Every structure is written in structure tokens, then in C-alpha cells.
Amino acid sequence: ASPFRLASAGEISEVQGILRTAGLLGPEKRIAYLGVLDPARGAGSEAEDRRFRVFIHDVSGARPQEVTVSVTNGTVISAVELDTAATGELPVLEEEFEVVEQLLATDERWLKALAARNLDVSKVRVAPLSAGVFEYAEERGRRILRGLAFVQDFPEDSAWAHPVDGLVAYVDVVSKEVTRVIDTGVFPVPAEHGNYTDPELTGPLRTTQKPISITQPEGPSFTVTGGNHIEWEKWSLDVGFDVREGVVLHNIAFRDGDRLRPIINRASIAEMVVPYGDPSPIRSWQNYFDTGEYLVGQYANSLELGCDCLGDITYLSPVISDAFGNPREIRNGICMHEEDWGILAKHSDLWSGINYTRRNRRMVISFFTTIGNYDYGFYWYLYLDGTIEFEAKATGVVFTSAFPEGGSDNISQLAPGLGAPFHQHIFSARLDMAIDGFTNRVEEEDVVRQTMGPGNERGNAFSRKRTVLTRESEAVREADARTGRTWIISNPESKNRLNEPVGYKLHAHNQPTLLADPGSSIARRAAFATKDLWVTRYADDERYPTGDFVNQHSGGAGLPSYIAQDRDIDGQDIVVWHTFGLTHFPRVEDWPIMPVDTVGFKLRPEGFFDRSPVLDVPAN
Amino acid sequence: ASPFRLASAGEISEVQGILRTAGLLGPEKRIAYLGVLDPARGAGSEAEDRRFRVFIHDVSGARPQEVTVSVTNGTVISAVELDTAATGELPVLEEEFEVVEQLLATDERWLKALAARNLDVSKVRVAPLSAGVFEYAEERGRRILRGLAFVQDFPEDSAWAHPVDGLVAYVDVVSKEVTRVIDTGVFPVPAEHGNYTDPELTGPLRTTQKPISITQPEGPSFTVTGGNHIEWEKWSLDVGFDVREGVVLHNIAFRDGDRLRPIINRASIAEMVVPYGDPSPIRSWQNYFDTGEYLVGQYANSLELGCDCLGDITYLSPVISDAFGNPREIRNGICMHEEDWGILAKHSDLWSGINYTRRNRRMVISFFTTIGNYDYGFYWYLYLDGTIEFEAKATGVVFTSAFPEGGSDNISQLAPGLGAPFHQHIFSARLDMAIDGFTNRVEEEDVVRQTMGPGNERGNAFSRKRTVLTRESEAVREADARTGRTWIISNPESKNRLNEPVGYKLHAHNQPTLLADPGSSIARRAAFATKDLWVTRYADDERYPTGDFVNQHSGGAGLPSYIAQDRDIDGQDIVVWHTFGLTHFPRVEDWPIMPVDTVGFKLRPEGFFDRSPVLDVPAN
């Protein structure tokens, strides 16, 4: 009965039928995106209305449509024809992944380039890469993918070990035309294989690892009701799934004695982008938005017990809509479990003689997605003490190139002749805050050093300052690790027992933001990535930091356009947008398959409770 | 037979006898420090010589001595009388902890101050606090402790809930004189109790937590030989214990196929300091060096199975020397165990069809210490992929004060009338590097942004620069999070298969360093804490960043004096000193006992291996 329940197969089937009856789902149509809409502010009417948003592609060249449907009432609410030269192209379709390779296989310029390199076309894989917006006037309003080539020596070979450098092609996937084939020169195709399951490369497997057994003999401490509502150690929330964003957390709240206290209304990773820093024309256009362009949720893995998730695991299997409106289940796509997390609090007192130890634990909600060469794990953690944490785990295979003779300032060498271009992985967390309710504000907190002198005669004093962000135009902030900068989200109308406003503090990792030149195409299209923190006033239609249609959008959509409204955010319904990322100079140890590296952020209570919230944890 | 073995009870007993026979351990003597010395460079002579360093205090006022003893040969090697006004006082003795309270209990000024506040002297606890060096000329060359008072309402009461503000006293612990009693005015003693085991405060304990069972049904994957030599998943090391430093790691090496490759010769936390930022005269002198002044190893806790360490635990029980040279065992003072650590590497490939998942794990070596109100866990982690990490976990009870009427810029309010002064916890890691041997160098690595223009026409390029630190005078470095600054320790004479020098990268957390004014006493005595990274040339006697005798040393000892030698560090035997810390503005949730907060650092391989070192990990 909950409005935040996962989409069911039956709901997806009704959308397909509603679209079909209305004449919007003909044979030349493809669903590029389908997702359930959140209830609007003021859901306290109990009037259930489940609405779905649909992006409909047309493979015959007609204009795509954005459609909103009520599955409860069986009606089309709105249907808009899109001018893609204006507002952007629709997300990449999984069925287009193979079309780039197949179109190039019959193009005379592509075949001439492969023949010069003595490459058999049947062995050449072509990655289907998003195009961006650059200098090619003929691409405006056309659906373009770019292709880079890799050789598979045999069907189980890792093609990433064998990039074909000096060659790139552009393809119009609707008209099935190869618009350009650029060949800048012959590079040797690196010869060593990268087959990390080949015993020749792994050597004899270790026999030294003994098993670690994690069991819960009485079952887990959390309960799941209504398919996706979790209660665990005073926490309460709903676990959503969206084909674009992946796992979304709703209605994060904490039961403080008698009262259920809201903390976060909606938490998601609303965009992620991988910009490449190699100035070669073969790759200098390369920036892929795995969320906005490819939709990370549709490529979620089925997670296997004992391997991907270890312990007493509860699974969710979300349902999404294929290019034709049929439901399919991502079996075991979300893992949920609790984990021991070491010591929570400990003290042995010299005067009372009391010895006290308590253990911590965390609730884990996670999924793993695979987009081409890269694989990412998304992890949300809830801790006993009120801390909320997000962690992204990056693994997979690094994107490769040739390593030029005489070296490179923008590419690392991984193996003889094999390079890996420098790049970043930058995420945007969208946190629709609800600290004790919707009247919230953000303060920026800096450490303050003090000069030795009157009132500070020994030169030991230091302090802090807090600056309230009152309008959107002043809420675009940068990190400052040297001054210990954090941001506090507080509720000025809800005080703790010391008559201080309740709050939560956001702790960033203070990694570098977008490194590209501010005048570049990617700085315009990924403007969110140039600053660490943005605060906007809540609005139903301000969902993504990059706008609704990221693919081949010319720039400036999303956050720079939102904040130009300069709305009041001092004690209002607000959304915090946090940029965080990894800057990756690949190392030899990243090849041929990369050990996990991590990045994330956390929020800790800051006077939210009237004392430690874990005094009632028992002694194990 | 290993020279790095833990001290045994028999060795301690021989030292005591050697000292006694030589006439250095009379009845007025106290051992303030006793520790085994590391073998000198060039231990490849197999000539075992176990030497111990001893600091001997004299309670009758005679000059203390520093003594070096050979337990193998039964001889005193050297014995030096110390001028403490020059080189500093000896570390605080545990037997002096009670002397401050007992001396004040019979002082008429102290009793007059308590009587004005209607405090019964039998209920007043006095913390024995290190004195530092300030404006009091009469303290030079005298052994001084300062005392701050706290009320215990009954024997099991938490005295920290009841600070007596406006009152401080100074005590000469050798002559048993109260030198000064300063009373700046009456503050109400905060009345609420802080008894975190009182059911009145905890409420009913939770019944919702179900057990988490961690077992290793075939035992652990690591082996322990010779009492303290560990081998685990290609790692090899020796676990030392020193009464000042605590757990010390020796001879950290990694078995890469046929070859045992050194990485770190010696790793320790060589100092830690807690400076307070409250300008009140009652506390503005307060800065305690838990390592250098109090010796964190002698206050190590006995760790209990299931509570402090969970899983299949192997314990070490180190032996130390009491004030009289008798051995005693810290039973179960070090926990060692392996932990599952999630996903190591994962990829599902669209072209090969291969699905690959491997799990990570880490080896944990830890101890917990308690110094008055504070408790710290020290954790060293070894990961499968070659990563080394250190984590400090801070808990215990925050140091309290009154909260002044009308507020404070330097104190947080925790409860009505109860404050917590701002402070930092700053650590110094001493890493005697041995990357593939002793010929090492340090490079500072910064991200380099590039301007859009010729050679970078799309404005996407970015790069990195490395600066070799060649002399000690240029090896005092600051963090720069905004430019992604890291430091690489490399061996210029050992190349990987791409003919690049092997290396490890140090990743800092980039937290603020010492906030005090540069002209302050604490900036002079804790100079190490003002900069993030120092590199020195190895020397046997350059052990601590603050020098050998931290207590009441006037300043400038340790690292500022070492680096003035301006020695060559470009391809030499070097030591990296990393400063890292927490800046603590206490929150309500820290009271009445603080949930763990953490800080640390890690080192990752950077071209140390010729490819990923975990390709031979089996599939669980």
C-alpha cells in the first residue's frame, strides 16, 4: 500500500498497454527510459496515484516523446514531442551497443584502415561511446555514437588488452550512416594478452586462504515489510530502484524514543561522469555519463551469495522495462545485510573502576553495475550512532590506448606498448534533506585560527565560524581541507535540549573536482562537477544535476540553470548536491583487472540528539 | 633466535639485576622507561646482542640517568647523568598519578578553595596533568605536575561530569610542595551525572540486536613463529611492543614469487599530542603528549574475546618493566586476526562473456590504551593487494569544563552548565622506509591543470608533476588537497618490468595540522605537528619527532633539530614522518561517552609490482 513501493511487473505491463492503446508505442518505438515518479509534496491525502515517466525513441527518425502515465487510472497525463537539437538526445539504447560495430564493418574507409593494420574485421570489437558536443555542425539534432576499436584474438579474449590507436569513427545510428572515419596514423596493436583467468598469467592459485564463516544463527536484526520498507536498529527507510539512478533511499528516519524523526527525504547518486585527460584527437572528446547517458540501473548485476555478498543476505529483485515495455526482473540485484563494525565506544576509568566496551555495526544496501569496461559498486551504510555513509567502489578494466614511443604526459604505461589515459570518476549525490522536517538551512563551517595577543596570551586558542547560505546564488561552494571545512544542515525551528538547532554535518573527502579547462565542452555539460557543494530550493522537476537529457546536450542544463532563480534557502525545503570523485593516474597494479578503489562521503549527527544515541546498546 | 623478538620476563629480570649489581637501582630509584633497542644497521653478523635502554628516576632529588645495558653480556654499556633543565624531564610515573591529589588535600589554599564551593575533599579527584613550559621561572629544572579537579559523588560516579572550574594547582612532585594555587572565581559544578551504565540514563536496553557469528572453521590463514613473526598472504613482518610507542611493526616485506621484497623497515606511532584551544588560564597551558609524556604502551588494555576482538583471534601478551624492574605481563594486550573486506576485483565482460569476482581481506594488528579520560585503539591493516593502512580510533570521555554563562567561542556545551573545550588529537607516524632495499627517495606529486590552447585544443588535458626532495632542508612539506597532493617513496635503483622505479604512494587524509599560533609554547614543543610530511636521513638516535625527553622540554627538540643537518636524502636510507590528526569540536552526541571517531593514512603500491599482485587469489 506504500506509494514508495518498487515497481511491479504488473505495473510495467499496464504502462505498455496504456501507451499502446493511446497509439504511442508503435513498432518503430523504443522505450529509452521508464521510471516511477515520486509522490508530490503533500502526499498526506492517501489518494494513491502511481505515475510513470517514459522516454520514447523512434527508430524511423520521428521525434521522440516524453510521456507521463497514471497506472492507477489508466490514462496518459501528458505527452510532449521533443526537439533534440534543443533539449538533448535520449539515453543510449542497449540495442545500439552492437549497431556501431556492424555499421563500420561494411564501410570502405573503416575496412581500409583495418586492412592497413592487417586486422581481420571479424575480430574487431567497437565500443559504443557517447559523442558529446564538439565542432561538428552536422551532428546537431542527430543521434551520434563514436567508436573506438579493440581486437579480440579469440572469443574469450580480453579485447581491452589490444586497443587500435589512431583510429576513430562517428556513426549516425538512426540513418545508419558513417559520418566520419579519422585515421591519424598506425600504432602497433599491443600484443600481450590480458586474460586474468589464464593460468599462464595467474600462475598457480593460492592454497593458503582458509575460509571465513559469517553467519547469523537467529537471522538478521532488520525487518523488511511491504517489499522494500526496512527497519533496523531505530532506522526506518524505503529502498527504491530506478533504471537511471540505481538504488534510491527514501524517507530515512530515526526512532528517537517515542518519535520518528526524519533525516533525509530522498538520497541518490544523480549523475556520474568519467572525463578523459588525453589531448589526442582519438580520445579528447571522451567523457561518458554512465548515469545520465547509459542508465546505470539497467546494467545492474545479479549478485551471487558467498561471492558478491557474504553473510546472512536478504535480496531485492527490482523490475524494469525493456525497449518494448515488457517487464524483466533483475534477480538478486540488491543485497542487504548487517555487518559487525568493530568498537563503538570504550572506556576503562581510573577512578570509578568501571570497564565498558560496546561494539558497532552497520546496515549495508548495495548494488553493482557494469557499463562496458567499468564496474562500480554502490554502497549505502547506516550505523548505530546515526552516521550515514556512501561509498563507491571502482573496479573492472581500465580503458586502454597505445603507449606512444618516447612517452606521454597524459597516459600511463601498463604493459609494453599498452597505455591507459588519465581520467577522473566524478559523482553527484543528490540529498533531499529533511532534518526533523522540511524547514532546513545549510551553514558552512570553517576552523578559525587566532593570533596570540590580548585574550589569547599563550597563543593556543582556536575556534570556528559558521556562515548561513541564504540564497541559491551564494550556495555554490568549494572545499577547503586546510581550514577543515564542513557543511551543517540544520533545522532552525527544531532545537535540542540545550536550545540549539538540530543538525547533521557533511564530511567530504576533499578530492579534486573537474580538472578540465573552464572553457571546455565538458565543463559546460558537467558544470556540477566544478564545485564541491550546491544547494537548491526543492522543485519537483529539478531531478538531475545535468538535466533530463544529457546525451549530446550542448551544456548549461541542470544546476547552473536552477540556481539562477536565486531562491530563498534559509529555513526552506532544500536539496544538497555534493560532488565527489577519484582522479585516476593508472598504475601497473591496475592491469589487467583493477583492484577496488573507493570514494564517498558521510553525514554525522551534530546536536541532533540530546546525548549519545547508543547508550542503550547491550554488552554483546 | 630473532633479534626482533619481544622482550621476555627473563630479560627484564636480568636488566634489573645488572642495574642493581652496578649500583644504579637503589631504593630511591624508579624506572620511568625501559625498552629494547633495535639492531643497528648491518645486523648481518649474526652476533646477537640484546640491548635495553633505561631511564632511571630518583625520588630523593638526585639527577636521573639514562642507561644502556647488554642483557646478552650482562654489562652496563653507558650511563649518563641528565641535567633536566637542559634536556627535559623524564616521563610521568604511574605512581605519581595519585600524588597530586594527596598533596593538595593537605594544602590550606586548596582546602580554602574547596570549602568556598562546599566540596568535601574526600570526593574531589585531581587529574595528574603534564605541565609544559610557560612563564614560571621557578619550574625550570623541577618536576612539576598540574592539577584540575573533578567531583565524584560516590565511588562509581563518573567524575568527568563534575568539573571544578576556576581552580588549578601546580605541584612539585619530588620536593612535595604545592607551588601555586590559582582560583579565578566560582563556577557552579555541573550537577547532572554522566553514568552511562545507570539504567536511569540508558533506559531499557535494546532487545533487537541478533548475534553475528564470525568463525574460521579451519583456523586462521596466518602463522605466528618465534613468538611474534607473522606470515600472511605473502606478507611477512615482526610485531614489536615498546612501552612508549606501543605496537611497532618491523621488517614489513612481501613475497613476490621467488623474492622477499622489503617495503618498510620499521613503522610506529612515534608521538601524539592533544593541544587544547581554550584561552582560560585554568586550561590554556593544557597540551598532553600521551606517547612522549605518559607512555601509551604501559596503559594497554587486556582485550577480551567477543567484546574487544571478534572472530578467530590470536593474542600476544607483551612484557614490560614496572617502576622497580619487575616484569609484568599485559595479558591479551595485542589482538591479531584476519577480516573479510568485501569485493577485491570484479568484472563482467560484454565481449568475452567472462564473469569474475574476487573477495578482499585484511590482516588486523591492534591494541587499545587508556590514559585518564581518553581511550585510543591503534590499528594496523595489511591488505591482499599490497595496501598498508593505519587507523586510530578515538573514544573514551571528553575532557570537560564549566560552560560559561553567555557562551564561549572555544568550548562546546554538552549538558546544562557542562562544557567541553575545543582541542585536537595529532599523531606522528614514523616510517623507516625500505622500498626494495634502503636506497629510497621521496617525490611530491601534484595534479597539473592545463590551459586550453595549442596542443590542448578541446581543453580536456590534465597531467601530474613529481618533485624529488633531495635535501632535508627542502623536505618539510604541507598537504594540498585541492591539487591532489601525494608523496611517492621510490627506489631509483630498482625498476619494474617497464623500467620504471618501484614505489609506494602515501595517501593522507588532509586534515588540519596544529592550529596554535606559531609563537606559542606548544608550536615550539610540538613543531612536528605544524607540517604534514617530514623526511630525514636515518640515524640510530633520531627516534622521536619531539626528542627523547618531552616532559617540560623547552622546545625545538626532535625534527627541527634533525633536519638542520641538511643531509642528502636522494637515494639514501630515509625516514618519513607523517603528521595526521582530528580537530575536535565536541558535539552533544559525544556525551557522556564518545562514539568512536577515526583518522589515519595508507600507502598503496605505485609500480612496485609488474601487474596486479592478486591475480592468484582463488574464487572463494
Ligand SMILES: O=CCc1ccccc1
Ligand atoms: O561506460 C560507458 C562507456 C562505454 C560503453 C560501452 C563500452 C565501453 C565503454
Ligand SMILES: O=CCc1ccccc1
Ligand atoms: O591523557 C593524559 C592526560 C591525563 C592523565 C590522567 C588523567 C586525565 C588526563
Ligand SMILES: [Cu+2]
Ligand atoms: Cu579510473
Ligand SMILES: [Cu+2]
Ligand atoms: Cu577529542
Ligand code: NA
Ligand atoms: Na542546444
Ligand code: NA
Ligand atoms: Na528538502
Ligand code: NA
Ligand atoms: Na631547556
Ligand code: NA
Ligand atoms: Na630507511
